[PDB]
Design a protein around this ligand. Structure first.
Ligand code: MG
Ligand code: ZN
Ligand code: ZN
Lengths: 465, 50, 1331
């Protein structure tokens, strides 16, 4: 109903409701619940044991805790794995005490020492395992729902049963099935995929239904964490629109700084760690100001000056404003250089790269008839010299060197590149004619002694200007 | 004839009826529309005749 | 290449265009002036900075031409690759192309039947749309809110699929249909029967058939990948001040790629839906501000607080790429210089500074120095130029002769505002312009900065010498009169030469000829004024070019014989013996060009300018204070005017009249006093008491210093002299009125500080008029030059056999122009003949030149058949023998002459200078048209019809006088009676339109009830009244149910009829019908019953022909025109013919003056409403031969009213191009109700209805579009994309696939090849045949 994107952005902000202090700690506790759901669901995964084993191998060569607790508290899950592996895989998979040992392995996981690089690896490995089993189910659906004339409802009732051995394949060749009698015409992909599913199951050491509900718990916890992150970032858009007042200069628009503070607040969500007892606005202020300075350093300038030189030139502008207020006169580079504790040539160098280049549509004249661009000199200049002599000297060499009735002109035209593509040295022109370099040098000196005399090369002499 | 075609009658809706004509797209509150009316018509920081 | 093909951009097409992709917002480095890897100016994506020089400095100097450096990807080639390398920004999300989103029309809603409000609802991330649903509730193209999306999510689940934004509408456009929707819309267009739906569904189905026929897809309309502009075209170049010179489009592209990188950082970081929807909305707004900044929202600012230039602001108006860098461009060899006077030169010769010719002709100087052996190399000749050697002036004089150069005034007014010249070498730093052609420039010596352009090659050199030299054209392209006529100073010298005296101190000496005349003038013994007899040898080519010798004595003066010394053989002395005004010298030059041709005319004009200069040097024409004499009876006129305004003031104080009548009376008496003092100064100025040869007192034409500038018309008309010597007539009030107190004093007496203020009121009003409306006329020239951009003479003559009936205007007053200058140069269509039906002397296809215009002038011709360009059958131009004569050459027009831009420069020529008792004035016979007349009982003849036009034809047989008579008049003379001038022949009251009845019988008041329909009110003026009716606004619904009508029948109960027809005698009763007659009386045929009462923006509105302030509708078919529903203010109008369209209705907004009553007989194409006529209905009912005739009778008379004559063909071919796109009425060839061009309609008739089979459907209806409308309806797109709304017509060209064949003349100007006009027409004759 409007035309400004920032006003309907404010409308979408006003659609959601803000937070009080108790609402802030409630959304922080919802973030904690969304994190800890994945933290306890990953304890039931068999690859977490190998992940903690490679973590113990990484910290073997190593406020903070002592490393002895990292050496001791990263090896009991290996013992639980080697006392569970004789029950979860051997002597049948469907067992109650095997699931009790699985829960015992899961309840000893709280020795986290959380690192954001460590958290990505288990999520990535479980996501590509979920992607592998999902494209396995997708290719099975492509070979069974689309082919052999049976709908999607005749697949899930046999898919949810075992999905381990060959019983589900000839379960789809049921009591009559005249449309699905093509056995060997469809077997060639499905048993090759079932062997891949079986080797995946023997890699994880568990049936496909348990890892299916484990990945469903992963998706549920990730969706709940995403909704908690969404309400956290939506309740704090007043923070970015209230912090974006102090950086409202004419280098960028408002919306780019707002959406950079949005990703700064999104980083501050996972960098919050609310158990210290602080508010989200106070710690998020630093991250959003960092994102705002990063956007005003990378963007808001045609010539992209980096963030450290942006910081030094902002300090130089503040020192120049302070010396303007303390003196009244224009700030010389000497006082700014001695107050910056930097040499003066670096001060003038960062002063040279002062601001965005004058755009092409500024009215430098008296009216709006002639803008900029009608005053720029050509860098690729084509002078009367550069247009006339660059061909007339070529014609003069083609006229004079044609009088050279031997191979000296043929070895001199490739000595510099006249009527040739690649410029050659004496060695490359030697291998064609005269492999000893000094023969070509002596014939070049003879051609020089023939051409340097002001008798017939005076037209070549007049081209020195 | 102005009072036969008035969009809103209340003071709130009325004031708001303005906010939509001045700054469209943003649904205002009572205090926001009141502050916009004050700083657009009856504020010394945005209006001076001397 | 020979054609330009446009389409929509595919993402695979951009991927083939790319040769490198940009992913980072860096442009260049800030310390070193080198772009790093993968940037907006990078060397891998676009190319290197210098010619054969890589980034890091590893491969250069022609050694590596096509290899790629593995360190940074740079391809070592020239700088020319930096102007052709594309973009391919990897967009993470698809976005909206704002050219196809917020245009007028938008072209994305008309493809989908979705309003623009809903388009703003879906593209801005506020509302969802569903592509397909499992139930009929969620159908295609449904607009869902977020709460409705949540309701559909909890209600349906996985059955529906509804996204939001550009991706949703992208999938909707991609997976709707391809041809099944087109077939369903094609059958549902003619399945339904309506008019409001069949004006948009036909445009939708034409858009869709263009999409299927051009091979385009609606997926390619939306933008999924954005390519950047080449970085040399947006150059970040270091200027010479320390800072950099960037473009704002670089800033917009940096912001677009920054939002794209933020989107790419938001996809992998698992962003919530609010931030990613705001990111896609901001990417849409950023690409919208990059494409067209003034459509989607607020214009994006920069550092200097200015709206930045988008891709649409780069092509828009005069500041766009077209009118500043493509059409009107800066050019080399162009020297800005002022104008000076060279009077010692020929007509084809101009002056040139030696410094400006030295620097301007530098390649010619270097080539002539190298070819002569005087210079060794180029730079040695350059050092000879920079040090000013003596020999380079001689070589510049050698190279400057036989080398024409183009002089050009900026800005030009018409075609003769720029032409070639053969320059000479003089000193100074300015160009000596020949004085005869400054009137053709309309560039007085005010320091006008003239550009001088050098034709380089021999093609352009001979094109300058033989075609556009000033010796090639002595006439103007606007009119047959020469605008290269002798101008003010030389015509003043010639008028002083041809003047005669009564004293005449060289009296009695008989001069032997021109020789003795110039001898006794130059010796000083005889003056320039001597009424003597001179033996003059004169020659006339009465035979086929054979001149005859004769010498006799003529009563003339000495200076006329000295001019005859400069006059060549072929002129007669009938043009030399008069007073020789400016119009007389124009007629002399015209007759010289008709008789002798171009070969003696240029030498005659040069000798006339030389003699006028030499005898204006010896003239001594000097204005003074005693020369500008005050009339002796001037103070008594002001005293009588003061007594008259005192009488008017006393009649205003003592109450007899009002203030408005006081103002009208004081304006009338001040105009009378102004006319009296003007005749007083004219009698004191044109008469001078001079002595005869003996002692006598005889008046003559005066030797006053201002009467030479007044009578001859040198510089200034009679009004300037009447305001200079006499008092000022009338000024201009800023509200539009006239000041009631005019200036009593004159300029020599002095103006008071109040009187100077009243003068400067109208003076500053006229100066603001000259500042605004002349620029409006310049933009009108820009308008009219872009509708006739394809009219080139292709063939010689087509078999059309149809033309116009040409007649002069005698509208209102007397005649203004004859037929000789009106059909001057035009070509006849049929074999026209005498007014008598015998002796056909004119062939089929011939021009109207000498021995043809005078051969009709000796006859009493009044109307001839003339072949036009509106009836020419060929396409993409007209023929040579269908247009007539090229006006600046004077012969058969050559194949290639572009008539349309000639007409544009001709209409643009006077744009800088525009700013009842019917008494006959001649003798002739009374003739009428559409006659319905009858004799009443008083001896006169009343008129009972509307379309009677009184015209007067004398005994010779010409239409000297004509009038326009409304309905209800009384003629005092009969048809075929010889009348005299001055007397009134038409007598009717101008304040009312009567209801005069031709039924001679009794009076009967029938079908009327007093109280409900009519009332009873006796008139208190004369006492003669009856049962009358008031206005229709006061009556009740009795007239709305029963129609009130006066059935004038006999009083014995029986009914009578109309004499001539079979209709019963029943007149109708409209409003204000206050009848003045009783019942039972025997009225006669012709008795009255009641009394019913009644310019350059106008030029632009008549050229556009859109709608006037009050549209004057016309009657469609001849028959009975009645009313439909009764008058609810503005109800209806119906037309019921006898053999026509019976149930067709109409609409009347204003019921002020109805010409025909509700139920009487009309003619097809007859006027209904009075006022300014809208030409849409005039073209819809009358043919093109009537509308074109009406325009060349109206706007040519408007241009003539200012005081300038234009040939009517230039206001005819623009009108021919105003109906270029027509409206087809039946399907079978192209479409049912499309707007198709006349070329596409002519190529369909010649293919189907000529030799293949019968009529598959090819009838159409012509439409006069607007000038802004016809420039957007051209079949060629690249000329349409330069006039105005380049965004709109460029989107219409992109979505339709309009492949240009470049047939028009500007279409080859824009692409940069040879034009298909003039000398390039013979090149295009080989180009279009070998293709
Ligand atoms: Mg001027
Ligand atoms: Zn390199
Ligand atoms: Zn023709």
């Amino acid at each position: 109903r409007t035309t400004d994107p920032v006003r309907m952005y404010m409308r979408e902000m006003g659609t959601v409701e803000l937070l009080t202090r108790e609402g802030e700690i409630d959304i922080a506790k919802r973030i904690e619940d969304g994190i800890n759901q994945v933290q306890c669901s990953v304890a039931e995964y068999p690859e977490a044991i190998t992940y903690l084993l490679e973590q113990y191998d990484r910290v073997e060569a190593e406020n903070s805790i002592d490393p002895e607790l990292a050496r001791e508290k990263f090896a009991e899950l290996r013992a639980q794995y080697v006392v569970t592996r004789d029950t979860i895989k051997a002597k049948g998979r469907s067992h109650a005490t095997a699931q009790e040992e699985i829960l015992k392995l899961s309840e000893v996981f709280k020795q986290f020492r959380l690192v954001p690089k460590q958290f990505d690896y288990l999520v990535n490995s479980m996501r590509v395992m979920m992607d592998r089993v999902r494209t396995q189910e997708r290719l099975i659906m492509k070979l069974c729902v689309e082919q052999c004339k049976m709908p999607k409802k005749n697949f899930i009732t046999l898919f949810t049963g075992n999905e381990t051995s060959d019983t589900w394949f000839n379960a789809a060749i049921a009591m009559n099935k005249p449309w699905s009698e093509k056995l060997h015409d469809v077997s060639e992909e499905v048993h090759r995929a079932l062997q891949k599913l079986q080797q995946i199951e023997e890699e994880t050491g568990l049936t496909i239904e348990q890892v299916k509900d484990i990945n469903r718990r992963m998706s549920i916890g990730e969706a709940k964490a995403r909704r908690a992150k969404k309400e956290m970032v939506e309740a704090n858009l007043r923070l970015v629109i209230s912090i974006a007042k102090k950086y409202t200069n004419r280098g960028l628009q408002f919306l780019d700084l707002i959406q950079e503070g949005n990703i700064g607040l999104m980083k501050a969500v996972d960098k919050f760690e609310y158990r210290r007892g602080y508010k989200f606005s106070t710690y998020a202020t630093w991250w959003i100001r960092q994102a705002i300075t990063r956007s005003i350093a990378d963007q808001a300038r045609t010539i992209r000056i980096p963030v450290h030189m942006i910081e030094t030139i902002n300090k130089l502008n503040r020192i120049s404003r302070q010396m303007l207020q303390e003196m009244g006169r224009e700030p010389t580079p000497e006082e700014l250089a001695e107050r910056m504790l930097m040499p003066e040539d670096k001060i003038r160098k960062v002063l040279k790269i002062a601001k965005e280049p004058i755009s092409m549509e500024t009215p430098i004249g008296d009216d709006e008839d002639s803008h900029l661009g009608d005053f720029i000199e050509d860098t690729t200049l084509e002078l009367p010299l550069d247009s006339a002599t660059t061909e007339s000297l070529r014609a003069a060499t083609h006229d004079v060197l044609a009088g050279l009735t031997a191979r000296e002109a043929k070895v001199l035209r490739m000595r510099f590149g006249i009527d040739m593509n690649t410029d050659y040295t004496l060695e490359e022109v030697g291998k064609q004619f005269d492999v000893t370099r000094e023969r070509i040098r002596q014939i070049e000196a003879k051609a020089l002694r023939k051409l340097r005399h002001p008798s017939r090369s005076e037209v070549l002499r007049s081209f020195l200007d | 004839e102005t009072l036969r075609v008035d969009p809103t009658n209340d003071r709130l809706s009325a004031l708001v009826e303005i906010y939509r004509m001045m700054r469209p797209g943003e649904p205002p509150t009572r205090e926001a529309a009141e502050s916009l009316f004050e700083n657009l018509f009856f504020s010394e920081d945005r209006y001076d005749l001397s | 290449f020979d054609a330009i093909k446009i389409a929509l951009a595919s993402p695979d097409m951009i991927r083939s265009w790319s040769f490198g992709e940009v992913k980072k917002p860096e442009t260049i480095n800030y310390r070193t002036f080198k772009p790093e890897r993968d940037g907006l100016f990078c060397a891998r994506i676009f190319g290197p900075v210098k010619d054969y020089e890589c980034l890091c400095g590893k491969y250069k100097r022609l050694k590596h031409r096509g290899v790629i450096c593995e360190k940074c990807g740079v391809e070592v080639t020239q700088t020319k690759v930096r102007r052709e390398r594309m973009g391919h920004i990897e967009l993470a999300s698809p976005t909206a192309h704002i050219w196809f989103l917020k245009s007028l029309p938008s072209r994305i809603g008309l493809l989908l039947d979705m309003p623009l409000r809903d388009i703003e609802r879906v593209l801005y991330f506020e509302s969802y749309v569903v592509i397909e649903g499992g139930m009929t509730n969620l159908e295609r193209q449904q607009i869902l809110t977020e709460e409705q999306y949540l309701d559909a999510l909890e209600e349906f689940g996985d059955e529906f699929d509804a996204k939001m934004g550009a991706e949703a509408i992208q999938a909707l456009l991609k997976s709707m249909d391809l041809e099944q929707e087109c077939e369903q819309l094609r059958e549902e267009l003619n399945e339904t029967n309506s008019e409001t739906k069949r004006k948009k569904l036909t445009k939708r189905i034409k858009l869709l058939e263009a999409f299927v026929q051009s091979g385009n897809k609606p997926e390619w309309m939306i933008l999924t990948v954005l390519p950047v502009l080449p970085p040399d075209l947006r150059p970040l170049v270091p200027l010479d001040g320390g800072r950099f010179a960037t473009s704002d489009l670089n800033d917009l592209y940096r912001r677009v790629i920054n939002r794209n990188n933020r989107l790419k950082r938001l996809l992998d970081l698992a962003a919530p839906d609010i931030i990613v929807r705001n990111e896609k909305r901001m990417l849409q707004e950023a690409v919208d501000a990059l494409l067209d900044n003034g459509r989607r929202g607020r214009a994006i600012t920069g550092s200097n607080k200015r709206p930045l230039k988008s891709l649409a602001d780069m092509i828009k108006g005069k500041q766009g790429r077209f009118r500043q860098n493509l059409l009107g461009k800066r050019v080399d060899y162009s020297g800005r210089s002022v104008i000076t006077v060279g009077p010692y030169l020929r007509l084809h010769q101009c002056g040139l500074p030696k410094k400006m010719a030295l620097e301007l002709f530098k390649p010619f100087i270097y080539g002539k120095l190298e070819l002569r052996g005087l210079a060794t190399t180029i730079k040695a000749a350059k050092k000879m130029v920079e040090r000013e050697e003596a020999v380079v002036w001689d070589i510049l004089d050698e190279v400057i002769r036989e080398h024409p150069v183009l002089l050009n005034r900026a800005p030009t007014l018409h075609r003769l505002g720029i032409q070639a010249f053969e320059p000479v070498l003089i000193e100074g730093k300015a160009i000596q312009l020949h004085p005869l052609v400054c009137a053709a420039y309309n560039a007085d010596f005010d320091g006008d900065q003239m550009a001088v352009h050098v034709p380089l090659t021999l093609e352009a050199q001979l094109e300058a010498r033989a075609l556009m030299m000033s010796t090639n054209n002595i006439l103007s392209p606007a009119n047959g009169e020469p605008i290269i006529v002798p101008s003010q100073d030389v015509v003043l010298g010639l008028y002083y030469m041809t003047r005669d005296c009564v004293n005449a101190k060289g009296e009695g000496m008989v001069l032997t000829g021109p020789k003795e005349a110039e001898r006794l003038y130059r010796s000083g013994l005889a003056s320039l004024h001597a009424r003597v007899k001179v033996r003059i040898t004169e020659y006339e080519k009465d035979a086929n070019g054979e001149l005859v010798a004769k010498t006799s004595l003529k009563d003339t003066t000495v200076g006329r014989a000295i001019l005859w010394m400069i006059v060549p053989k072929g002129l007669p002395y009938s043009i030399v013996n008069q007073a020789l005004g400016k119009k007389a010298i124009s007629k002399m030059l015209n007759t010289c060009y008709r008789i002798l041709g171009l070969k003696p005319t240029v030498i005659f004009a040069d000798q006339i300018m030389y003699t006028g200069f030499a005898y204006a040097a010896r003239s001594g024409a000097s204005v003074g204070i005693d020369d500008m004499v005050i009339p002796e009876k001037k103070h008594e006129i002001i005293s009588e005017a003061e007594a008259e305004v005192a009488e008017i003031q006393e009649q205003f104080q003592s109450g007899l009249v009002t203030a408005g009548e006081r103002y009208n009376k004081v304006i009338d008496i001040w105009a009378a006093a102004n006319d009296r003092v003007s005749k007083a100064m004219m009698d004191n100025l044109q008469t001078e008491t001079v002595i005869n040869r003996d002692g006598q007192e005889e008046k003559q034409v005066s030797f006053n210093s201002i009467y030479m500038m007044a009578d001859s018309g040198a510089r200034g008309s009679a009004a300037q002299i009447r305001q200079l010597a006499g008092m000022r007539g009338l000024m201009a009030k800023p509200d539009g009125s006239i000041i009631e107190t005019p200036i009593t004093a004159n300029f020599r007496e002095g103006l008071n500080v109040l009187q100077y203020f009243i003068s400067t009121h109208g003076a500053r009003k006229g100066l603001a008029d000259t500042a605004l409306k002349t620029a409006n006329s310049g933009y009108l020239t820009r308008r009219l030059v872009d509708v006739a951009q394809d009219l080139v003479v292709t063939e010689d003559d087509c078999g059309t056999h149809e033309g116009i009936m040409m007649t002069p205007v005698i509208e209102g007053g007397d005649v203004k122009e004859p037929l000789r200058d009106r059909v001057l140069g035009r070509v006849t269509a049929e074999d026209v003949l005498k007014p008598g039906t015998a002796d056909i002397l004119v062939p089929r296809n011939t021009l109207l030149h000498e021995q043809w215009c005078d051969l009709l002038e000796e006859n009493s011709v009044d109307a001839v058949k003339v072949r036009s360009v509106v009836s020419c059958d060929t396409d993409f131009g007209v023929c040579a023998h269908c247009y007539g004569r090229d006006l600046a050459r004077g012969h058969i027009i050559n194949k290639g002459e572009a008539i349309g831009v000639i007409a544009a420069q001709s209409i643009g020529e006077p744009g800088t200078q525009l700013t009842s008792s019917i008494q006959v004035k001649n003798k002739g016979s009374i003739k009428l048209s559409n006659v319905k007349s009858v004799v009443n009982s008083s001896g006169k003849l009343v008129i009972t019809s509307r379309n009677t036009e009184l015209k007067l034809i004398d005994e010779f047989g010409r239409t000297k006088e004509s009038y326009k008579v409304p309905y209800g008049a009384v003629l005092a003379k009969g048809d075929g009676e010889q009348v005299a001038g001055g007397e009134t022949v038409a007598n009717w009251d101008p304040h009312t339109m009567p209801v005069i009845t031709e039924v001679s019988g009794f009076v009967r008041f029938t079908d009327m009830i007093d109280g409900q329909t009519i009332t009873r009110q006796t008139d208190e003026l004369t006492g003669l009244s009856s049962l009358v009716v008031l206005d229709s606004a006061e009556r009740t619904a009795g007239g709305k149910d029963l129609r009130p009508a006066l059935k004038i029948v006999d009083a014995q109960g029986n009914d009578v009829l109309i004499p001539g027809t079979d209709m019963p005698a029943q007149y109708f009763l409209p409003g204000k019908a206050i009848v003045q007659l009783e019942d039972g009386v025997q009225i006669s045929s012709g008795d009255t019953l009641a009394r019913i009462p009644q310019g350059l923006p106008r030029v632009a509105d008549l050229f556009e022909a859109r709608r006037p302030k009050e549209p004057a509708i016309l009657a469609e078919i001849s028959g009975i025109v009645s009313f439909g529903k009764e008058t609810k203010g503005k109800r209806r109008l119906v037309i019921t013919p006898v053999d026509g369209s019976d149930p067709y209705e109409e609409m009347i907004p204003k019921w002020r003056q109805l010409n025909v009553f509700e139920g009487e007989r009309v003619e097809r194409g007859d006027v209904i409403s009075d006022g300014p006529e809208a030409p849409h209905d005039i073209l819809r009912l009358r043919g093109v031969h009537a509308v074109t005739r009406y325009i060349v009778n109206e706007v040519q008379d408007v241009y003539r009213l200012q005081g300038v004559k234009i040939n009517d063909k230039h206001i005819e071919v623009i009108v021919r191009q105003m109906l270029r796109k027509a409206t087809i009425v039946n399907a079978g060839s192209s479409d049912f109700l499309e707007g198709e061009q006349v070329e596409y309609s002519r190529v369909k008739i010649a293919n189907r209805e000529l030799e293949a089979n019968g009529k598959v459907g090819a009838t159409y209806s012509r439409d006069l579009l607007g000038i802004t409308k016809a420039s957007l309806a051209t079949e060629s797109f690249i000329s349409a994309a330069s006039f105005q709304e380049t965004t709109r017509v460029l989107t219409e060209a992109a979505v339709a696939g309009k492949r240009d064949e470049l047939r028009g003349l500007k279409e080859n100007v824009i692409v940069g090849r040879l034009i298909p006009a003039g000398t390039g027409y013979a090149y295009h004759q080989d180009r279009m045949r070998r293709r």
